[PDB]
Amino acid sequence: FNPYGDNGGTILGIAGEDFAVLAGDTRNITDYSINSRYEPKVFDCGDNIVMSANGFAADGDALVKRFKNSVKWYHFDHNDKKLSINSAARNIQHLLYGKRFFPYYVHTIIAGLDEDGKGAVYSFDPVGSYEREQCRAGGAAASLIMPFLDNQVNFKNQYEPGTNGKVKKPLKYLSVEEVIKLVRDSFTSATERHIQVGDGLEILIVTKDGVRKEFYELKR
Amino acid sequence: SGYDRALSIFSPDGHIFQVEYALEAVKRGTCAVGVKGKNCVVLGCERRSTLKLQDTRITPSKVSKIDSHVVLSFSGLNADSRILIEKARVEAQSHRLTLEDPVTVEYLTRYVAGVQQRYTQSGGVRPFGVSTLIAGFDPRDDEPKLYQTEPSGIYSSWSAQTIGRNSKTVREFLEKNYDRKEPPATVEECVKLTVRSLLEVVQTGAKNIEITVVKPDSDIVALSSEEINQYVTQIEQEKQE
Amino acid sequence: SDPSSINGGIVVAMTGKDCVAIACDLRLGSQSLGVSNKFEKIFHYGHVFLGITGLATDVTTLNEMFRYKTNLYKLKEERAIEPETFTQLVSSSLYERRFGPYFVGPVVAGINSKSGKPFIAGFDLIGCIDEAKDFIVSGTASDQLFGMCESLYEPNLEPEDLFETISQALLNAADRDALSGWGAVVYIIKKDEVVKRYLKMRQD
Amino acid sequence: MDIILGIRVQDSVILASSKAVTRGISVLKDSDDKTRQLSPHTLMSFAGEAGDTVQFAEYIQANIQLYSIREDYELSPQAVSSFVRQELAKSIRSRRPYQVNVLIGGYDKKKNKPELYQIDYLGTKVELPYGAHGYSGFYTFSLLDHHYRPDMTTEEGLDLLKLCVQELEKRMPMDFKGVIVKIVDKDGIRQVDDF
Amino acid sequence: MFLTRSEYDRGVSTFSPEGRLFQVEYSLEAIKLGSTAIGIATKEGVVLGVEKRATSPLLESDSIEKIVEIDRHIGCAMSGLTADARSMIEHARTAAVTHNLYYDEDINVESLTQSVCDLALRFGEGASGEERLMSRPFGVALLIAGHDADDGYQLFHAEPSGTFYRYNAKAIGSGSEGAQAELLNEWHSSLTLKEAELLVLKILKQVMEEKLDENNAQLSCITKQDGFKIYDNEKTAELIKELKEKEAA
Amino acid sequence: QQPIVTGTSVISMKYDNGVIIAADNLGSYGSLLRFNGVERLIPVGDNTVVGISGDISDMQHIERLLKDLVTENAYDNPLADAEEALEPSYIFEYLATVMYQRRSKMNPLWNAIIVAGVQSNGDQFLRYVNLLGVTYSSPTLATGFGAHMANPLLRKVVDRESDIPKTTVQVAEEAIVNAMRVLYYRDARSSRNFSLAIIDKNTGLTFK
Amino acid sequence: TTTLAFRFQGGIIVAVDSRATAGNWVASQTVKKVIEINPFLLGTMAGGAADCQFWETWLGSQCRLHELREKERISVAAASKILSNLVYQYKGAGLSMGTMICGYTRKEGPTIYYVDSDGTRLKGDIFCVGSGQTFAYGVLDSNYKWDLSVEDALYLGKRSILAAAHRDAYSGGSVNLYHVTEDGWIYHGNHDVGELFWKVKEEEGSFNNVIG
Amino acid sequence: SRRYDSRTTIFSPEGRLYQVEYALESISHAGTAIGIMASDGIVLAAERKVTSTLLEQDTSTEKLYKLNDKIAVAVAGLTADAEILINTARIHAQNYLKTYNEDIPVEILVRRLSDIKQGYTQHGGLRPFGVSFIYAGYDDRYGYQLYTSNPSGNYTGWKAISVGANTSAAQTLLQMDYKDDMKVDDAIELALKTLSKTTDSSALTYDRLEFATIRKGANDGEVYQKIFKPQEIKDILVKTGI
């Protein structure tokens, strides 16, 4: 017997300076079989948070359903307190670490705004390790798009023209139209050399005014 | 009345009674005393020897030792005394196991107390008719320390105490002869402050006393009956008057 | 490795005319080594004797628990234990642990103080009561001793005549066994007295 | 590997040890004190799988100090050695056992005769004049019954041991970074300084 | 019918025909014993203040701790049955610390006050269907003076009955009724910190048997910047003589 | 576990006025084909169905309680014939969270559950779940070899979300019935038999 | 994965890498590996990531409510033990801690302790764990001394780890250096390897048989 | 007053538990039991109340008992509650020997076995035992020993005691003729005199009694739980000239 397998997906999500986003595939596969064409993966979990579970599907949903339910007990008890992200950094450390010996084969990420208006996204193991990043991707196609970000987002591995060795080019806090134009190039830069991804694009733009979400289409 | 049976229920004043009735049972039991200076802490207890057949090498000694660096006394009734010690010293010894640093004394007394405040919670259990005195230093510190427990489940720190019978004589005797801001500073003086604290109530016997002291370096000692008769008699000279 | 094939010990029992004889070996150690010249594998409770083989923990641990009991059955019934109950006790006191058991070849020996009779028996590790009358053995070297004891024991024997046929049955076997034989010991028993002899053999 | 050994003599008792810890490939530390002072005139020393070694000793000594505290008349080794195994005889058949093997040396007073005991991770208890564990005693169940008789003095030990060690570190392919030694007698434990 | 209180008094779970059960109302009478307490809140600083009931001249009065720390931004008092306190607060802190795990943040103050009040209610069913742990509802009436970001500086009154209130200027214990009228008429909404420490060291004078010094009293003051601290003796004696230098003029 | 009496595939599709789902009628023991009188479709109310595959021992266990679930709805709700009745989303979550709490216990149900029906507003509903508890939805679904063979086909009829009201019933029934032909033409364990279920937000329901 | 810590008369030091590796391709390079459990103690998270920082974190709480009640500060002989006692009752279950503890106090002076899933702990003077621990030894073990100075240490931690990335793939990213003493744990920066490599090359003149 | 007598956890205002003291008059109904401590071997003794003719008062010892080859007991109190805590004592001594492989000391089980009688004067709706004992032992630490255990849980070590009925005189008679050397055979001739002079009857037969003796007196030192049979108390009994 095998209790868990695979379903695919490949996600990524970024913080700007006064915003953030989160991106996720929109296909479900069993064993090179299109199990479906459009099934979402990313959810506004109240108190303007977005998260995603890329990997096994059931565990990737039951985890969420405990988080949509923890969030409200945080409001009923503590009188409608808005739940920061630092809380969910190690709350989710516990929901998962409650299963260390029969765990959740899921790679969870979160997107939100901190107290100072900045954005941040956290990454996770399937067994509850909470870390922070600003450029992150996960799933099966995760070792294939991060190195496009460090050479664009963080400008890594490229000095500036004129010195050949001394001076690094400067940095800037990327804007939204950079990111969406970038991530919309990412999957189109993957789905042609990869099979599991394709068939949709769900960006979850977060801002102070609230939440948006855009959709686009790819090669079936 | 009706409110003076159990533990669960209160007066229409607030008083809970049975606990107050245990402390009446303390006072049907022999004295005890505890004094501290700076390089020493002491303890006393008026025993009896009122029977001749009874062998005297295992004399009923209120004192008990919890570890090397701790001692104890009690009052009240002794059928319960053997219990608290037998759980106390267990706990000190299941501490350094779990922590390899022996007890801060304030950790101990919150476990002799703790076993009393569980036996005053639920009916179907009786309190302890007992009231203790602790004396011992910490490891790697000089500050001399002393508490007392009490079946209400409380405890306080004391520079000098006397409990058991006729304590209401010995306290005020110690309210003059002491002074918190100039303690005795020698292991003789606490004893002399301590012996003549017994001599008010003890029919000028000298076979009817036990003293046991404590110091750093895991030190404890019981004293000799002949080492008391010269700590006794020399006082009597000093009231030749 | 088997538990039974680790330390090494051999015991013997044999009936005789108003006398019996029991003996054991003294070697003990790990696999392919020996540590002690001196481990009395044989014991006694009341007049009734007992001998154990196999794993040493379950030697030392069976001594105590049986000693925990017969010092009650004496206090409780005001009478010593006799064998033919004892031989049943060791069955049910082992058959409770049919799973996670002990690893022993026991024996037993004694006289029944009412009818002046002799008695012995043997067992296995879950309590099959063998009631041979001529002799019974146990240890690592059983197969090396059911042969060189059968041909040597007649019926209706006399104590010292019965003595020297234990030892030679005990010596010529243990000298061939691979995991035994640093000094021996023997008991000859009569209705009302007992004596202990040791024996001489090799060394390391 | 993690060797250990000890010797009985006429008027006192000796025990030895090692000083080495190795976890994986790297030899971490060179001063591991692999004993625990149960009582003043008694001492034990243990070898086995990491973790199972240590907190066996602290467990029982906490029980032995608990018997010395209330009777105020310490108990002979033969009540200890009979007691210690009583943990192990039931520890092996339990769920997680304690794969440790130990020595116990001391000095009973009322007789004024010392003792020695050798116990394994199963329960095999027996007194010897000399003993060890691991793959050590293979090298030393041969000397200590040739260059050993029971009418010695205390200095014979280290002098009969300072070569016995050499037999091991001359053959034993594993470093063990030396040894501490300590001795038992009426005036109590005594640690040696140099070798 | 006159035997309404005489018989329905002792069992906890007996409604009397007046609707009420008494053995809780007597628990309220307990904390009327013990030594008094005060709590005043401000836009700038919360403050407490107590007497101590000097019982004998040889005790070491740092021991009886009517005031405690409970977390870096919270502090308590209590004017009731003593031993039933240390069963309370070793729960109350335990939530705040536990909360720092499950949610990584300085807990609010009221939630703590709601965890306590969901503990003394265990002569019955608690919130989450629990069953029982005691039968002696205990008098430890608290004052939980704390700070949290949503609403600033607060205090509360947590009672055994469970129900609590966000008082602004409270005083419980034996010297209450003479005080809680006195604080009724001298609480602005625009006081300072030190326009209160002197105040609470004036009511405490007149209400208490003995005279006032450093020895028979102390007090505390949390602050969002520094935290809970129990002031020092010579610091308190500064304020006491300061008061007299204000009275005569 | 490991099953013996395992069923076979089923098929679904959504359309403008409703949905269509159907199965075959068969009970296996291996290569053998013992039983052919069974069904695969357990109606619930008059808006909803459930197709089943996998171990027929468990399909009997599903129908036992769904009939009880609706039964224990009727307790103390006279209103609950009209609007407070069982629409499908009131159901499927029961057949989903049962399973995840039956997987993690490690004695699962090797059925593969499909659900079809209509809400009270009138919109389409369709969803699916295997033994592990995973879930998804699309306008057309199948199980086993039906999804490896006939799902690509029917998506030619219904590509994606747009062309759903570009469709009717007569065209819908005339697709899967040609997919039925395939499985009886090539599928190993299929049988010539059939069992149909249509739903309509206006005319309601019918059956084989 | 390559970490360490050591003593000297002034204080206690901690040095770490920043790897986040898996199989044969890296997941990240921006991970803290020393747990700010409280202002006076610190510990490494080597071995299993989550299996550690759920429990050092946890230990911050017990040590906190060990302070509130006896009102002084906790020792370190406590913290190395209760964490040891804790894990031993879980072994044989698949838990993979390997780490240490670091603290300075007024009573034990400095103090250091090791700890691991196997359930031991040992006092030390130098520790270093990870994948390339042996590479770490050769630098300091030849060099340091208990009478050593400060800024040599904070440099010695840079070099004693930096031989890892030059020799290993599973230990790199960036370096983080702390310095502990009675007042607290003192931060000394995140430092990347590709910017530190070229510096120490020309300065130390090491890497004698290497480009640049 | 409002009567505080009904549970053993009620604490009258004067501090005294009534329902314990009652036990300490449930003992006077018992049958006397004496033990004198020699210099070279303790003696015990006893006396029975019911002595009708047609019941086997020959072999059945009802008071005297053993715990092992070192220790003996003489009971005074209820008999339903003697088997309960004299099998327990046997079961305690062995389960000490079994796991320290040396014999039980007296001061352990008397310390233990009395805390058991305190575990019932405190908690539950339980009763306290109506029992007392007279222990008689030997051990390396102190040698000869005598001890006593009330129905409370309080114990004390002695040199010569009577329990049960009419101890008042039987102490008084005893304490004014107990020399301090008292060779063993000179102890027995004291114990009978106490029972001879304290009882209610005038016959003091051989059937009503039993008195045993501990003895170290053998060479190649060891202990001997010598219990006496009816046939030799008669020698003890004619020898005195009753």
mmCIF file of C-alpha atoms in Angstrom, chain D residues 21 23 25-29 49-55 58 95-98, chain G residues 81 84-85 88-92 114 116 118-120 122-124 133-134 137:
data_model
loop_
_atom_site.group_PDB
_atom_site.id
_atom_site.type_symbol
_atom_site.label_atom_id
_atom_site.label_comp_id
_atom_site.label_asym_id
_atom_site.label_seq_id
_atom_site.Cartn_x
_atom_site.Cartn_y
_atom_site.Cartn_z
ATOM 1 C CA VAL D 21 34.811 9.442 22.147
ATOM 2 C CA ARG D 23 31.054 9.701 16.669
ATOM 3 C CA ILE D 25 34.783 9.601 11.827
ATOM 4 C CA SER D 26 35.952 12.410 14.097
ATOM 5 C CA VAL D 27 37.414 11.879 17.545
ATOM 6 C CA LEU D 28 35.737 14.692 19.435
ATOM 7 C CA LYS D 29 37.031 14.685 22.961
ATOM 8 C CA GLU D 49 25.848 2.886 22.952
ATOM 9 C CA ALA D 50 25.785 6.659 23.251
ATOM 10 C CA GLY D 51 23.083 8.078 25.488
ATOM 11 C CA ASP D 52 22.273 4.680 26.926
ATOM 12 C CA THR D 53 25.650 4.860 28.672
ATOM 13 C CA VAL D 54 25.289 8.090 30.606
ATOM 14 C CA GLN D 55 21.836 8.305 32.021
ATOM 15 C CA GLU D 58 22.707 9.009 36.975
ATOM 16 C CA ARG D 95 10.773 -1.991 24.571
ATOM 17 C CA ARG D 96 13.897 0.189 24.360
ATOM 18 C CA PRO D 97 16.683 -1.494 26.308
ATOM 19 C CA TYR D 98 19.957 -0.212 27.679
ATOM 20 C CA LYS G 81 19.914 18.161 29.871
ATOM 21 C CA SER G 84 18.600 15.558 26.232
ATOM 22 C CA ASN G 85 16.040 13.935 28.521
ATOM 23 C CA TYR G 88 15.867 10.071 24.466
ATOM 24 C CA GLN G 89 12.245 9.067 24.917
ATOM 25 C CA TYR G 90 11.709 9.533 21.167
ATOM 26 C CA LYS G 91 14.660 7.707 19.684
ATOM 27 C CA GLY G 92 14.039 4.746 17.482
ATOM 28 C CA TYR G 114 26.804 19.083 22.577
ATOM 29 C CA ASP G 116 22.117 14.908 19.377
ATOM 30 C CA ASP G 118 21.262 9.611 20.090
ATOM 31 C CA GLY G 119 20.819 11.180 23.493
ATOM 32 C CA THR G 120 24.186 12.328 24.782
ATOM 33 C CA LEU G 122 29.332 16.478 26.578
ATOM 34 C CA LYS G 123 31.122 19.584 27.717
ATOM 35 C CA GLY G 124 33.807 20.914 25.436
ATOM 36 C CA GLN G 133 33.472 19.281 10.155
ATOM 37 C CA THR G 134 36.894 17.719 9.651
ATOM 38 C CA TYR G 137 39.258 21.320 12.730
#
